[PDB]
Amino acid sequence: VYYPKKYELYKADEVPTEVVETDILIIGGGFSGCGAAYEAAYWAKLGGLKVTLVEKAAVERSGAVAQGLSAINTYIDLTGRSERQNTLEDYVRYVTLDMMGLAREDLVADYARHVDGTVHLFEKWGLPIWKTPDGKYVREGQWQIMIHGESYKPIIAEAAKMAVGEENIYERVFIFELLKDKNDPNAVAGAVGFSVREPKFYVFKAKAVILATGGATLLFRPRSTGEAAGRTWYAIFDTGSGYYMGLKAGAMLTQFEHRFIPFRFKDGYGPVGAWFLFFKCKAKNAYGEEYIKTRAAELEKYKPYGAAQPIPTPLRNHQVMLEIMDGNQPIYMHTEEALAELAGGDKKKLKHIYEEAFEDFLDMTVSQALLWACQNIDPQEQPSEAAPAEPYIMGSHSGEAGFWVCGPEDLMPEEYAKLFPLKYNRMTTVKGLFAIGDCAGANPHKFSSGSFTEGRIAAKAAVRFILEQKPNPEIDDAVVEELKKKAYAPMERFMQYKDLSTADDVNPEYILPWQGLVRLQKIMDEYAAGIATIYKTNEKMLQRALELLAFLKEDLEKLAARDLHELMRAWELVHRVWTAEAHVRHMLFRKETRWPGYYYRTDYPELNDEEWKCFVCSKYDAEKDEWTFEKVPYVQVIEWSF
Amino acid sequence: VYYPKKYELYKADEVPTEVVETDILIIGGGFSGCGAAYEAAYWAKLGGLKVTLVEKAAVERSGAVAQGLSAINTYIDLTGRSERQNTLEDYVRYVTLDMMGLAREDLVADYARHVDGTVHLFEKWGLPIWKTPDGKYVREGQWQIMIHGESYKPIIAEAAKMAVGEENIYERVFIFELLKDKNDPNAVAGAVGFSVREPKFYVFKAKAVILATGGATLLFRPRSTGEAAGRTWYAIFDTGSGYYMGLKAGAMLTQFEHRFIPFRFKDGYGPVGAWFLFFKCKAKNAYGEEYIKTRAAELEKYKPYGAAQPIPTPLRNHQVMLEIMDGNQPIYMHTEEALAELAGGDKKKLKHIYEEAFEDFLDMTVSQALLWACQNIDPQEQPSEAAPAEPYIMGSHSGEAGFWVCGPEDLMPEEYAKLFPLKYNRMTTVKGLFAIGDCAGANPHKFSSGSFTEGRIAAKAAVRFILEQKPNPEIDDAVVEELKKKAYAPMERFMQYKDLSTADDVNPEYILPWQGLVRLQKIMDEYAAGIATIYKTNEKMLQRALELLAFLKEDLEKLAARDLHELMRAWELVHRVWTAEAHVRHMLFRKETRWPGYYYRTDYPELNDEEWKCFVCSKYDAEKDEWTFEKVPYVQVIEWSF
Amino acid sequence: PSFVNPEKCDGCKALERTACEYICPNDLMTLDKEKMKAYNREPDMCWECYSCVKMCPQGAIDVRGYVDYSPLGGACVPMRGTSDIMWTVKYRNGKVLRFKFAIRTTPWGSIQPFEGFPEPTEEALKSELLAGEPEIIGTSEFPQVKKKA
Amino acid sequence: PSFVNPEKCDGCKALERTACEYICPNDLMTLDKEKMKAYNREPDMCWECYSCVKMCPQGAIDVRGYVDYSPLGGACVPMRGTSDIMWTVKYRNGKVLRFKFAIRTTPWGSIQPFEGFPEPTEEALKSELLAGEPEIIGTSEFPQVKKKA
Ligand SMILES: Cc1cc2c(cc1C)N(S(=O)(=O)O)[C@@H]1C(=O)NC(=O)N=C1N2C[C@H](O)[C@H](O)[C@H](O)COP(=O)(O)OP(=O)(O)OC[C@H]1O[C@@H](n2cnc3c(N)ncnc32)[C@H](O)[C@@H]1O
Ligand SMILES: Cc1cc2c(cc1C)N(S(=O)(=O)O)[C@@H]1C(=O)NC(=O)N=C1N2C[C@H](O)[C@H](O)[C@H](O)COP(=O)(O)OP(=O)(O)OC[C@H]1O[C@@H](n2cnc3c(N)ncnc32)[C@H](O)[C@@H]1O
Ligand code: SF4
Ligand code: SF4
Ligand code: SF4
Ligand code: SF4
């Protein structure tokens, strides 16, 4: 709910337009965007190219890494700088198996061979990595390393700022729509946005555009609906902006049905990675049973995925869901037993691991430490409850939803290149438009290091694309003006109909952003496998979701906004609604249940490797208002075995 | 969420006290309260007794019947004025079986032998009852008759007003606590309240007090959490006030674990009584399966409850719950097929029943007709989705939660009289304190007519009590002053700590009513068999609920309020929190699942007629702050066999 | 929830009391002394009971379905009289339905609470009989119910 | 959610920018030109990331746990420096914990993005190598991966 102190209204025609001409436009200054800005600045010199970074907030703390992170989840370690070395083949195998068999190995192997260099740069730039007395990076699990990362984002932001120059970074500018080449219906030409600090409309003309807006949250109703609706596990700041603009432009999406349901400390959603992998904490149901044991047999039907090590995350969730359905909650993270075991009676050792335990929270999700403080929970004395949160849509973490993107020429097989007009690393099916981080699908487990890395990859590819293809996109001024009117329409609608009621938020001719959002969350929660149904859905429910989303989409044409802040909220809602529709259509299309634990199609409860071992890709045609789906069979690109 | 336009703050010491002396004090001007006022006015003449009715809103439309009702759910018909006559023994058997074997038959038979007179008076007073061409009352099902009841409450309010006199009715006065006899720890002496229209503290001194505040809603998080959090199926106006004040006084509660889960049209919660019983509507899952038939086998284990006709409501609920757990939603009410079948090809007949269908909604839950309009749903063309709402606590409807009350001398067996110091009809275990309607437990299926009737019964008994025992309790002025300080404490706390933050609703030293309510709803939803877990709970979850409620109860001492409206909201929250605690403790005590469909104890999934065919009664001792429970075995009072 | 139309609301300043403020069962309707016009002070606590709507003499109050599940466009408008009530249901798609139902068969304020009832007596006070019984029940004798042997 | 202490907030004296308003990733912190003091404009959209808290030069911002699940009394207070950050955690029950963690091993603003890197070339633009590679990876050559036979 939002209650502005005062109005801040503008009519489209009263708003000045600022035109910005650049070569490479990066939308989103988070981890992937900063990686793109950093690398782009390096190669751009070859053609004296201009690189521009636009961010809706402030790059210093914007995005998922705002509070910092307690670990770098992706560090292969090909030389032995950490406590454990790994191979690239084992990593690729790991990711494909976690995806229950479906991952673009050309894309995964690609960011994996580059990621370590990115991590090494981070340390060089000042990021303090946990080290053993011997000087080795401290491992959390097999693929992650612990870090003192409170200033993780500020450090990376400084690197990007030093690389592209502050004069090329536009902050507090919300991008809401892409612009296409007037000369070519399947080519990008820039984007439009507006400032949230003043009345100013932005028109960015560019030769290449890189989507780095992060994923989408608040599509589904959370487990807390009051103030705590703000405590989403994933970045509440990311609202599927990239997904919206890209899909409207005609860029194909992939695996958009693949949402991620995080199992974390209940309510605060503090991290469990360190507790599970580093502290060796056990999770037990209300009766003291370690369900990863009691529910092990139930994974036998998922051969060979269920017999994989580590066990795929969705299957771990499935075990949790079985406990929940049987009514064995609360589920506890036995931190007290873990700390006691690790300390081994050594009081000084206990104090040290105790400090490590709290840092794991204070460096990334302070709310969990605050939750413990408010509820008088001392981890060395009592366990903490844990639970799965509502679904989130992103492609950099354990979820692989995002745009279908091209891979490197040396790894991408012919089977995966068919839909790309131009073969450039991380480019979407729309010429000149790239997608990175959460915006790039089918290659998850990137996390912080991998997302920055993917941005670097796309940035170099973008410079190459510009110098090789030499594009010269022309924006359609007629469309720009239409978009400018649309941009501020909510404010004009508020002024035009507010007199119909004595209450600004109870009007029959418009809905405010928070009202439309509550509605979206209810629809998704109840029909799109949200928490309301313990993540279950079926054809009828999904079809009803589309009907309700249709009503909502029509009502977006009657959105109202009272100030610039709420105008951004209005567009963030618009972005979320289309993201939700795409998610629903994708879930409806795949007639199987490949990721139990993330979602269940009760009408097609089994995993089908005979007919569905394929990536589901879709394209939205704005002109015809039609969605087209295609099945792209998975092919093993890298050598490995179960 | 609440955002007052401006402050309306008062300190206890600056608020004038108005002392009202009366003989009989009725708290709540709803259906049961009006029944009490009406009947008390008749007998009061015998002793020149004064009768006082206090209502927090306005009697004309206050309570559950604010919109009116489409039927009178309880009309036995012992002479044939309706389409179907019934016997009292059949009615008692019907209620006991619906309660899965647990009902105070002395109390049920008592209101049943009186209810028809009440209904006849209602018609005489102007209530239009549906009639056949032959002049017989139109039956909905076996026990209900259809009424044109838009003005049902206004008519009843008029009767009560003509009876007691307007000068004896206090409106817009919220009662928050009872007063006890200074010289008798188990006798009532009056009550305290405050105006919500002006700064005035009320002290009511009475010889007999009758609790008629209605049940409790909003204890559990609803299926809609935005504006629609206001669309509770049951009366949002009833917040368990009677439950709170009575339990604090030491009056014993009974069957407080027995909540009611209403199955209604989804979201709007329109009635299904007419659709099921009158229009012969069918309920089917997403695959066209009529689950009352496909799930018949699951009811066989319940003996003899599962073979009863009609099927007990909790078991009907259980069948749909199984469908929901299997993921076979949406659940549909096939109104289109019901109308087509009833009309039988006659277009004029169709138009008539079509109008009857809409009246069923417009006379009782306009929101459902509005929902249909907003969603373009025409009942003759397409079916509507239905769903069970969140739990509600009340004793007049299908739930029997409330105070343990005495029955009539001629029906109540010695087994049920042990806990009453004085044997007056409907008197609680606290001398001089009566409970009616939703406030009287163990005798459900009263509904509108039965609640008004139970009020009449308690009223006559109250007059008899006064004339026979000549009660003369004395209030404790010290306690009154402490309660006056507590009454306005929230406002004073707001003034004292508001300066700690620049935002009125984000303060570290206090919680506003809506903030404490959001917290309560979440706790109950997640641990006390709310919708979050499909109505399942266990010992561990309930124990955690008590720990969280403990934190909340402590924080109630830090409630803040910005105006009189919010001060009332503050006490309504206090009332719900204690009601919630009693509910949790009751569910925790009963080690069985007697009402699957209303709630499931996963740790005691079976119905236990060997050790749990008893009423569960509890007493809260405020001085010691201890709860005590005891089992009172059920005994069949009325002659009937399965 | 309910909302007030500024153009039709006159703050009941030509009446002895504010109708909407007086009738609301949840104390939501109140006056903005500044504009001298009413408003719903806490819409998420509105039960959409339509009491304020029916009692507003200016017909200035309407209801806009809860945003959680209501697409824009629908409306239910009542016109309450003395013996009946008229309703107009307007669908989002434009369809309009009209209904009319009876609400009372006697004049308002005409109830005589104990009409025909004999005076109460000390003897009667000790019985199970309520006012008007046993005849108001329709029987010459108080209804009997068989107790289990 | 975050909240500003009026007694410590100076609406950011004469500095060039309002810290809290500048840093918030969700655009929640803003100034009330009247009071010249900041506030969170939409607390239910607050991620409790503590960015505003850490950046307020007056330490006038704190966080009060979401009311949905937070009993009153708890607090986490950061004191962020240049090379480390200190935290004080106060429990509802009075318990007080103090920690201190490193946050950076180099001076702020000292990053040289391409330090030691060779200049880019048109030829290099066509390879799979990123800036600094394969040297920064630490391997004897650009990492190779086995393609499925
Ligand atoms: C939210 C969250 C995320 C993680 C974790 C815990 C929590 C609580 N933990 S673990 O415990 O789970 O394990 C991790 C951990 O310890 N270690 C690790 O490496 N990664 C973890 N992640 C993952 C990483 O953080 C993640 O992979 C990367 O940040 C993804 O990068 P990117 O895809 O670039 O998203 P971003 O959020 O950083 O940035 C997006 C930017 O876009 C802006 N933006 C969005 N829409 C925009 C628009 N319309 N116009 C202009 N700007 C617009 C954002 O403001 C932001 O600046
Ligand atoms: C909410 C609801 C209820 C029903 C139904 C549909 C819906 C949507 N439908 S069916 O479709 O389900 O079937 C019914 C139907 O068709 N026919 C029928 O006979 N009964 C139905 N009920 C049941 C009856 O309405 C019910 O049994 C009676 O109203 C119960 O009477 P009572 O127990 O007296 O509660 P009340 O709500 O009427 O009145 C309570 C009063 O107390 C006030 N109050 C509360 N707290 C107070 C305080 N602290 N201080 C001062 N006053 C304070 C209230 O303001 C109100 O005036
Ligand atoms: S009853 Fe109608 S005219 Fe009177 S104050 Fe309310 S809304 Fe305005
Ligand atoms: S609709 Fe009913 S609950 Fe809502 S404001 Fe009007 S009278 Fe009050
Ligand atoms: S940064 Fe601190 S001193 Fe400056 S405006 Fe914000 S709260 Fe006030
Ligand atoms: S805690 Fe973070 S999200 Fe909340 S107001 Fe501060 S900076 Fe913004």
TrEMBL record, chains A, B:
Alphabetical list of InterPro entries matching this protein:
AprA (IPR011803), FAD-dep_OxRdtase_2_FAD-bd (IPR003953), FAD/NAD-bd_sf (IPR036188), Fum_R/Succ_DH_flav-like_C_sf (IPR037099), Fum_Rdtase/Succ_DH_flav-like_C (IPR015939), SdhA/FrdA/AprA (IPR030664), Succ_DH/fumarate_Rdtase_cat_sf (IPR027477)
What Gene Ontology molecular function terms does this protein carry?
electron transfer activity; flavin adenine dinucleotide binding; succinate dehydrogenase activity
Keyword Flavoprotein assigned: yes
Q: Name one Pfam family in it.
A: FAD_binding_2
Source organism per UniProt: Archaeoglobus fulgidus (strain ATCC 49558 / DSM 4304 / JCM 9628 / NBRC 100126 / VC-16)
Site (Activator, Increases electrophilicity of an active site residue) residue list? 73
A GO BP annotation: anaerobic respiration
Sorted alphabetically, the Gene Ontology cellular component annotations on this record are: plasma membrane
Binding site residues for AMP 2:
264, 273, 397
The residues that the entry says bind FAD are: 31-32, 55-56, 62, 64, 71, 73, 175, 241, 396, 438, 447-448
Residues of the FAD-dependent oxidoreductase 2 FAD-binding domain: 23-263
Look up the domain of life of the source: Archaea
The residues that hold AMP 1 are: 144, 273
Q: Where is this site: Activator?
A: 140, 360
Which terms are listed as keywords in the entry? FAD, Flavoprotein, Nucleotide-binding, Oxidoreductase
Q: What is this protein called?
A: Adenylylsulfate reductase, subunit A (AprA)
TrEMBL record, chains C, D:
Keyword Iron in record? yes
Residues recorded as binding [4Fe-4S] cluster 2, renumbered to this chain, are 9, 12, 20, 56
A GO molecular function assigned to this protein is: metal ion binding
Keyword Transport listed: no
| Occurrences of domain 4Fe-4S ferredoxin-type (ranges) | 1-34, 37-66
According to the record, the segments passing through the membrane are none
Entry keyword set: 4Fe-4S, Iron, Iron-sulfur, Metal-binding
Q: Which residues form a coiled coil?
A: none
Please list the residues that bind [4Fe-4S] cluster 3. Answer: 24, 46, 49, 52
Which residues are recorded as binding [4Fe-4S] cluster 1? Answer: 9-10, 12, 20
Q: What's a Pfam family in this record?
A: APS-reductase_C
State the protein's name. Adenylylsulfate reductase, subunit B (AprB)
